[PDB]
Structure 1
Amino acid sequence: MLPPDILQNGEFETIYFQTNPTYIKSPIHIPKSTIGKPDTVKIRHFFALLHQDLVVLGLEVFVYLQIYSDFVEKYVYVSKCDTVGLEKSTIKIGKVIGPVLQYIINYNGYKIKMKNIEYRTLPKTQNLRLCVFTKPAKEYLFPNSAKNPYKNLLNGQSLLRWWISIIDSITKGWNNHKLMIPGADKWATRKFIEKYSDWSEGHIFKKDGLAVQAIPLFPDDPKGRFLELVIVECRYGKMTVSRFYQELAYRQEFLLGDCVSLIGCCKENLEVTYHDDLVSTVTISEYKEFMNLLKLVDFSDRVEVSNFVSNYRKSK
């Protein structure tokens, strides 16, 4: 997960846990009259880097397994990425995020219960989809950290360039790498990927038909937020994929936002061997309990942060 070469005294430690794999309804609407409907299994991943008693950064990633008879459609969605900045940075954040995200993408030791003692065996063929949105904000995970002396805030274009560099380095050889900047002319979007030969403009999802049957609705995703609206306004039987992305450009979040962007990469027909890797797994309630504790900590305050960390260590 993390290499000793970056740093290795014992100075830094990690928080890392997953939820127990949990069946959910598909984040992509599957028509009721469709054969070979897949089962969907979701796993939440939370990672934080600690230095001494302080949190340095955090990363939340959701993995969705669409399990078919002969293959898995595996979506990896970056939920949140954030830094604290209480101390002078001794390491480049991007060089921790990359490896952790790559580990999460490639993780295949999930203990999945049978669909209604005995765990389900997944198909060996997986098709990977990596989905990342870029949107600057003062804070995503760590309340009040924007006030901190060493928190570095990237503007939207800097943030996009940062994510492109990270994602490119961990998707080497993947079948595609897609960038969309809703509302931006294609020349402006092209400029971000001119030095990335394997990247092109657009998105990774099905191009035709209804948007709701092509695009996954991920939690707390600018794309998902519009999808939700389409569904509650019952425009879901009408709006195509192309029209969805056209109208997405005019959403307040995009049109008033700072280079809000959407990245998707795919790797097709990867043969995966199930590998047992023992990590801390928790119930959803335990996971949510942790996240709720998190949102109540003042991350501008060393005392509160150290206490949070102390309290976690005594737990497990």
Structure 2
Amino acid sequence: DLGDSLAKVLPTGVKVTIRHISSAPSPCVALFAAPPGEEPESTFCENHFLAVSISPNENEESEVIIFGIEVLVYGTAHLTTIFVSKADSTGYLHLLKNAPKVSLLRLISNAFLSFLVQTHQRPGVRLMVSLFARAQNQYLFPGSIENPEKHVLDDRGLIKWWCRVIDPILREYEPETKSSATAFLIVPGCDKFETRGFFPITARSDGKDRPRWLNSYPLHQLCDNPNAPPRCLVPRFPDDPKTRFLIDLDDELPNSGHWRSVKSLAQFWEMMSFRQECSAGRLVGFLWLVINPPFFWPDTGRGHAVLSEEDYKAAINFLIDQDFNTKHKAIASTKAWAEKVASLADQLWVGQRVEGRNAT
């Protein structure tokens, strides 16, 4: 149960209504490009979305979304990829009476990602957690930027934030030279020394022989065949600069699979440090987490709703094109979306209530 997992993290006396919309694992396009003369690996995709809301305590019906995060999960015969597509807030968490002044959203993200990792950890299968940190105003909640109480981080702050989010999950395993795990961060435009500054404080006190955080790219881990063309060595996530540049480079193809302007991965990233998304006056983060271990659904809470691909898209798109300019607008949009989800799942209500137990 996801509600139980999240309840163990949140502070004591924190009432939060959650909704977890997913889709059944269905065949999709391969995350990695196929080597020349071969076929793409069969990939099964699985969508996930978490919506965390509270109550301004007018009554009980009063409900406003404070956080939202969309994560894609990929599955092949060798790799399980957990990709954080989007994440955004509305800033109405301020409306919560006696706000504990904790990094709440960070804890929610950590808990959700941990739950997904645990419930999707396959026996003896490499598991990767990838994400693209770009600091922009609003992603999921239109007009939420006009909420003064919304604390929108900057580039550096957001990168450090995601790093702090992933850090515990990383340290839940053994160092790599008994499941192992290592983290990889790449900030376009920054040398290794300047990149190190984004790592959590704990990274300062790790083994020099067996580090946990590395400013590099998991090449020999993601790809068992380093002789394949560079185009087959980079994942092509939806809505990702990596993907766009990979297509732009693939436009140079008629040497099998070899580009013209980019001969290796190093050149690829050197070029990536000067793309339109990574050099618009703001820093950008690339984060990966590699884990190497030597009703058929885990989440059982009422917050969970398994919809078809079509219905999932319908629900999510219904949510992300709403208004959150004011409190009343946010609450109204929350109610409307909740009802729409209830309709798509053929239920009278979707979502569950969670109360934190931890107080340390």
Match of 2:50 among 42, 47, 63: 47
RMSD: 2.5
> Can you list the C-alpha shifts for 1:15-36, whole angstroms capped at 9, x where unaligned?
101111110121101226448x
Number of aligned residue pairs: 295
| Residue 84 of structure 1: aligned partner | 90
User: Secondary structure at 1:142's aligned position in 2?
Assistant: coil
Taking the aligned partners of 2:192 and 2:239, their CA distance within structure 1 comes to: 26
| Residue 250 of structure 2: aligned partner | 231
| Residue 266 of structure 2: aligned partner | 242
Taking the aligned partners of 1:215 and 1:5, their CA distance within structure 2 comes to: 34
| Residue 158 of structure 2: aligned partner | 159
Residue 226 of structure 1, CA deviation: 1.5
User: Secondary structure at 1:125's aligned position in 2?
Assistant: coil
Please say if 1:260 is aligned against 2:259: no
> Can you list the C-alpha shifts for 1:72-94, whole angstroms capped at 9, x where unaligned?
31011110111101341635211
Please say if 1:220 is aligned against 2:220: no
Taking the aligned partners of 2:249 and 2:285, their CA distance within structure 1 comes to: 20
Instruction: Map 1:139-218 to 2 at 5 A.
Output: 139-172=138-171, 173=173, 174-193=180-199, 195=201, 196=203, 197=206, 198-206=212-220, 208=226, 209-218=228-237
User: Secondary structure at 2:125's aligned position in 1?
Assistant: strand
21-30 vs 200-209, which deviates more? 200-209
| Residue 10 of structure 2: aligned partner | 6
149-158 vs 90-99, which deviates more? 90-99
| Residue 79 of structure 2: aligned partner | 73
Task: Decide whether the 8 Å contact of 1:210 with 1:241 is kept in 2.
Answer: no
Taking the aligned partners of 1:169 and 1:243, their CA distance within structure 2 comes to: 32
> TM-score scaled by structure 1?
0.85
**Amino acid in structure 2 at the alignment position of 1:293:** F
**Amino acid in structure 1 at the alignment position of 2:64:** L
| Residue 114 of structure 1: aligned partner | none
Distance 1:214 1:5, change over 3 A: closer
Taking the aligned partners of 2:323 and 2:305, their CA distance within structure 1 comes to: 26
> Larger RCO: Structure 1 or Structure 2 (Cα < 8 Å, ≥ 6 residues apart)?
2
| Residue 107 of structure 1: aligned partner | 119
Please say if 1:20 is aligned against 2:41: no
Match of 2:312 among 282, 287, 308: 287
Task: Decide whether the 8 Å contact of 1:86 with 1:300 is kept in 2.
Answer: no
Instruction: Map 1:266-305 to 2 at 5 A.
Output: 266-269=290-293, 276-278=298-300, 279-305=304-330
Distance 1:312 1:147, change over 3 A: closer
**Amino acid in structure 2 at the alignment position of 1:59:** I
Distance 1:60 1:205, change over 3 A: farther
Task: Decide whether the 8 Å contact of 1:43 with 1:63 is kept in 2.
Answer: yes
Larger C-alpha radius of gyration, 1 or 2? 2
Distance 1:232 1:142, change over 3 A: farther
Residue 289 of structure 1, CA deviation: 1.1
**Amino acid in structure 1 at the alignment position of 2:22:** Q
Task: Decide whether the 8 Å contact of 2:319 with 2:337 is kept in 1.
Answer: no
